[PDB]
Design a protein around this ligand. Structure first.
Ligand SMILES: N[C@H]1CC[C@@H](N2C[C@@H](O)CCN3/C(=N/S(=O)(=O)c4ccc(O)c(c4)C2=O)Sc2c(Cl)ccc(O)c23)CC1
Ligand SMILES: Nc1nc2c(ncn2[C@@H]2O[C@H](COP(=O)(O)OP(=O)(O)NP(=O)(O)O)[C@@H](O)[C@H]2O)c(=O)[nH]1
Ligand SMILES: [Co+2]
Ligand SMILES: [Mg+2]
Length: 169
């Protein structure tokens, strides 16, 4: 059965865990139980093809970690998450994308840019800005809300499709 190794990356507090737990449990994370870095398995059918998603929800990029090179080597597709209320989280996408491409020694790595927390009025990153950046990178851009569940499935399944298209190259 086809297996896809997906990695959710981004700055601290952008909602990497909340997006992952929404896909896995259909439930929004509680602040009184913070999610620890872990992987999750979920079998889904996308465009009539069955597959197993193995998703690694990573710690914030500024948090301490010894597994970044290994997850970037193993990862087949990356969900590059920023939060729409955090300009640094958006600007730092540059750094994460560059590190993934460096580790994987590839200019073409399946990626989706995700602007999370779309429910928040306190927006500091405009949709158009992030759209244009994604066009420059040649990747899809999706705004999501882990809180409201808006576009969460779309974000992950779009990434699977990007990996499928990459495997066809
Ligand atoms: N649940 C326990 C045991 C497992 C611990 N892990 C996470 C481990 O499952 C991840 C396996 N793994 C990977 N293993 S790994 O050695 O690189 C690793 C990276 C980060 C981790 O937190 C762990 C392992 C780990 O300790 S890479 C990877 C990708 Cl790219 C996608 C999906 C994956 O499942 C995946 C967390 C605590
Ligand atoms: N309003 C709103 N808050 C969200 C959303 N997603 C996550 N949060 C909030 O953001 C905070 C951090 O969420 P979490 O998912 O743990 O972020 P993370 O990116 O996984 N954090 P860490 O880098 O430490 O692993 C929590 O207070 C959570 O409730 C969202 O879409 N909307
Ligand atoms: Co750079
Ligand atoms: Mg987290």
């Amino acid at each position: 059965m086809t297996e896809y190794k997906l990695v959710v990356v981004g700055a601290g507090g952008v909602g990497k865990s909340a997006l992952t737990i929404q896909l896995i449990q259909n439930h929004f994370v509680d602040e009184y139980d913070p999610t620890i870095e872990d992987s999750y398995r979920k079998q889904v059918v996308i465009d009539g093809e069955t597959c197993l998603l193995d998703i690694l929800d990573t710690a914030g990029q500024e948090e301490y970690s010894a597994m970044r090179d290994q997850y970037m080597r193993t990862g087949e597709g990356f969900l590059c998450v920023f939060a729409i209320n955090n300009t640094k989280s958006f600007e730092d996408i540059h750094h994460y994308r560059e590190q993934i491409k460096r580790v994987k020694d590839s200019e073409d790595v399946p990626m989706v840019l995700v602007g999370n927390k779309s429910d928040l009025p306190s927006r500091t990153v405009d949709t158009k800005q992030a759209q244009d950046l994604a066009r420059s990178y040649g990747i899809p851009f999706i705004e999501t809300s882990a809180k409201t569940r808006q576009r969460v499935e779309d974000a992950f399944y779009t990434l699977v499709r990007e990996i499928r298209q990459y495997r066809l190259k």
